[PDB]
Design a protein around this nucleic acid. Sequence first.
RNA 1: GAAGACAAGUGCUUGUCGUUCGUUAAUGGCCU
Lengths: 349, 475, 493
Amino acid sequence: KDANASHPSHSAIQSLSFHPSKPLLLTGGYDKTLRIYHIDGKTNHLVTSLHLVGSPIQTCTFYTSLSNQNQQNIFTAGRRRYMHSWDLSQTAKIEKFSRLYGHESTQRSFENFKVAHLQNSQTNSVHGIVLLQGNNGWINILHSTSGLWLMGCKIEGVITDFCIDYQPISRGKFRTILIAVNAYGEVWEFDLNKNGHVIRRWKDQGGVGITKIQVGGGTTTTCPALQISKIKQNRWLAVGSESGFVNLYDRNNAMTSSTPTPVAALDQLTTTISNLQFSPDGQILCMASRAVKDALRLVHLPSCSVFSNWPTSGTPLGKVTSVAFSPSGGLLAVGNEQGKVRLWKLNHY
Amino acid sequence: SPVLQSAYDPSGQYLCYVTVALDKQRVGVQPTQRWNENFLYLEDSKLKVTCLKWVNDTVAIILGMNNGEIWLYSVLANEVTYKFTTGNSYEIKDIDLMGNQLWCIDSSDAFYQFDLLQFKLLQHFRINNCVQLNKLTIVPAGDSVAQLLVASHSISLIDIEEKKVVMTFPGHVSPVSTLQVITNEFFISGAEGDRFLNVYDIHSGMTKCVLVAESDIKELSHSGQADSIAVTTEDGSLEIFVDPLVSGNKSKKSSKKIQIVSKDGRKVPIYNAFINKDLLNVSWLQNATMPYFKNLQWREIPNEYTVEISLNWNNKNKSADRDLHGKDLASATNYVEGNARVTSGDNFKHVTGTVTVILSQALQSNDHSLLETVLNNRDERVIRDTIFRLKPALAVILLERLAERIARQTHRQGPLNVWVKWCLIIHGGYLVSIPNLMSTLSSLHSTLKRRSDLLPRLLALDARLDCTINKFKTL
Amino acid sequence: STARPRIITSKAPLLPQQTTPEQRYWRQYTSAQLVKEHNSVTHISFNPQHPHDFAVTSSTRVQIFSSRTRQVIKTFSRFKDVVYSASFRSDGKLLCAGDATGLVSVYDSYNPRTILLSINASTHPTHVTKFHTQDNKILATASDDRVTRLWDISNAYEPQLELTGATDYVRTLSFIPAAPHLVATGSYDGLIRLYDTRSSGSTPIYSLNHDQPVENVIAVSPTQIVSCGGNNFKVWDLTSNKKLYERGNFNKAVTCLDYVENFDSPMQSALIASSLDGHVKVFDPLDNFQVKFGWKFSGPVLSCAVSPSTAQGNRHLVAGLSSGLLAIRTKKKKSNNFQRMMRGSEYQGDQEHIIHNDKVRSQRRMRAFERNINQFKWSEALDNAFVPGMAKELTLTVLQELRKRGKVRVALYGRDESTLEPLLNWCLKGIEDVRSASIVADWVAVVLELYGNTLESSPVLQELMIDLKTKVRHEIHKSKEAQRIEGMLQLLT
RNA sequence: GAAGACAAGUGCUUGUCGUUCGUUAAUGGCCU
């Protein structure tokens, strides 16, 4: 049963997220609502439905701290200058991140954010960070709870996407690498663990108009681990274009070759890529387009082959605007322009 | 309903309830009187909990379920202590534990008996003439275990010792859902989707009476002295029959009814009520999975009752930091003058060719468009002669109108100062006679006092002007 | 944190005769157009049901106007002698026309072509023909024959009740909204008759002893009527049979009078009256019928009328003068894929659980001086105040607030010889008022004590200080005269 | 009003205090 069938939305569902431990799907769209549903097998129900006033929601992801395991903040933003942070009776503690502590000239919109973690490396004090797109090349990194501007990296050209890769160096210590892309394909790899610098820059073979990068196969900003021990380096890197192609890169030779050859250039989607999401095991990559009905393609990994029997001509998709995986159950929640998040279950998991 | 199966402990202090969690079932225990975060997940996505029972030496619950084994799970430490293994691989439709002799039903009608102290299986044991069996209870005849009841779409009392069925009962057209013994001679029986409950005699075989509900029957609990039966219907409500065994005569309807309806007008479903000596514990789901409870004495409650609770249906989010509108409460509320009237301390309020007749006409009526035409003249002998032939009652009106024009027009203090001067001279004798002069000439006195206190400030500017004027006139 | 307070505009103690809220509503009746007429207009009556029309009478021609276009919609030119009155019915369909030839004609509104009815009254001219207010089928007319008649329009040949007992020249009558059996009748010698039509109807129940002739009677209330007669106008309580108020505030005799209740106004109801001096004065029964506002026209006014309570549009004041003039004063009043794109913009949270509004409410925009004071550019703030198009009230506000918060010396440290000239040009025009001269005194004395060295060489500021000297001679002497007339009030008290 | 302590003269003179007693002017401005 669809998760929106308990209580329907009114706008197009713009972003989804699953709780990293709890069964909880957070839905948000231009309805200015954060509808947290529960995910049963048969009877979904509303856990809560918070309606902000005047604040459209484009991206909304959960965040659980690595060390505390009890904060469970809910970060949402939109085409405004603020980001609403919801903590986890009757009321709701909602603070807004309407303060660029150094400079509001770069990011006049908060709508493109992704929440990752970071290690101090002076102390072993792990904490969340939020990363925001800016004016031209500026990716600005803020503190997740204190709100201070921590650091900020600028790429050349126009940002179109950014994703975050982890690297465990030693016992209980990991270095976070931010992977950001130009329109051209000049992919940069910043090292956020130390101060603002670059590890490597390279070129995606193709990708004249690039929409999304997702780094998956391990711990990612959408489906992370719950502790410093289970943080694992991602194994694959997907670079999505706007002409429908998606170029995959295995990290075992993309970190070495410095101008890496794509493993396979998938072509089965035509319109612009709206979502790239990897399964938490790393074996199913979900590419989704939003300019046409029935624009979902699952590809087997590492065979790089689209599944033939899924999806068919009788599946209900609509204009697919946001896809979500599940961290444990292997579920797949797919949004639409009709605001009906429809739920599927991969039965191997 | 999001909660699949929930079972109360004896004496009503906790319940263990199972629920779906990303297509992996989890079991949790909640106190019912007074949050919680401790659950047991099932590590496989296929195996599901079918039946549940408590044990009255830590408190442990019983999980006989789909995979074939029967789990023994201690509440205090989230850990299964032992798994009782059925020899075959079939789901367990029902469980019962009295003494140390656990009893369960295979899906293929095979009874089993398990010992708690030895952790052993006593006797895998099958019967005839019951092709499906899905519910069992045993009788509390003493310390013994004999003559367990087993039932599925018909009820049969079966003695263990002779391994035979003793007496059958005419069951129900649907499979039986609730089968509990109440007293030593009567046991309740209820089907699935049926609004009927029968107290069948364990010795006579004839039903004593039948209990009808208002809707279909899902969950049932009973008091130990057989004076109250608390049955939770499927649609979400609760009926309580008082004294079901008292002597329509054959069918007894709901004595009292308890519903739970939220404050906004929405209805709230009810699952798994509990009853005791004058104590009822209605349970429901506040959020999608979190269970909320309410103790309530059910004898003073009338025949129809609606418990009202507070769901945040359209609740405005008040904040501890925020005020009613944006600002903080440690933010000092700034002074705003706004639309405040500003007055003064002197403003009292209810404390030869003349133009006399055209001025008196312009003062008896409030024709200000003609008073100015009279007042354009500046020939001072005419001003003397007009006040001479002026009505003294109209002169007080003239002083009020002249005061309003000198207050509004500061440049008109030239010609109108001789008008007020000549009026107070001629009608001076009448003005002493009228006593409330502060009431009448309040506009005159306020304009004059305000134009007179300026003078030390204007003199201070003028001599300081004359210092710099005499500085440059000399050189 | 704390939100920054706005710079509050300064205010002196208020002068007497300030603008009342009731004056501020009534002075919106602007754009007074004037339409020439062939004779003295005597009656203006609006439409009760849909008040977008009002009928104006003239020499043999009642013409219907509009509330929207304020122009002539139709004309009625089927009259032998001059038409006197023209009153709409409460249904708004059928309008009377009392004619001086003797017989009255009533026909449908918005239709000159279909003369629906022509009742022959007595051979004397009929001055007023009014329809019933609560009832909608009975006409009441007067005449110079000193009798009023009540005609049911089903029988337009014989009067249903020949209401007699009048003394001389009944020229205005009115009904009473509570009782349908009670008809007020005003003669032309005083003696305001109150008649009963449920009775035999040939003698009044009582009379109101007005001395001078009455020209208009209007029911201001179910239990109060108001009498427009002679130099004043009086109100009467009907049940007590006693006068209550009397307002002698007119130069000549009041002629016409109209009343409106529960229209959108700062007061509950308003009573207007034409004064035959060009003055139409408004009164309110809650404030003991005192005068609140009075417009003045050129010639004397014979007919006054206001739009009724339920206009729902531009309201009108129609006043008709003796010289054939109708003065009208009027208070006036993408792609379908992109809607399926963003659908939740018009939702506002009608069914969600928790609503959290945290958008801070936008204020009035900040002015040029308030921005510079907040950014502490005090020297640039003082030059920002004296832009010549800006009001004199807020130039005093900048001078006060920069004196209070900062200093007047900090705003004058960086001044040049040319930069002082906008400052001294305003104190020339501001020294006269009492409202500013306490602040002008400090703001000029800082120039005299600091820039008294540059006056020695620059002749331009020398002319400014001389002209300030010649204006403070007038100001002190005016204040010296003000203390003399202050010395008057202690003599005569 | 006094004492305790440091600079400018080729060893003392030339001022002031995060010292006690007695006494009626670092280009540096206020969020979202």
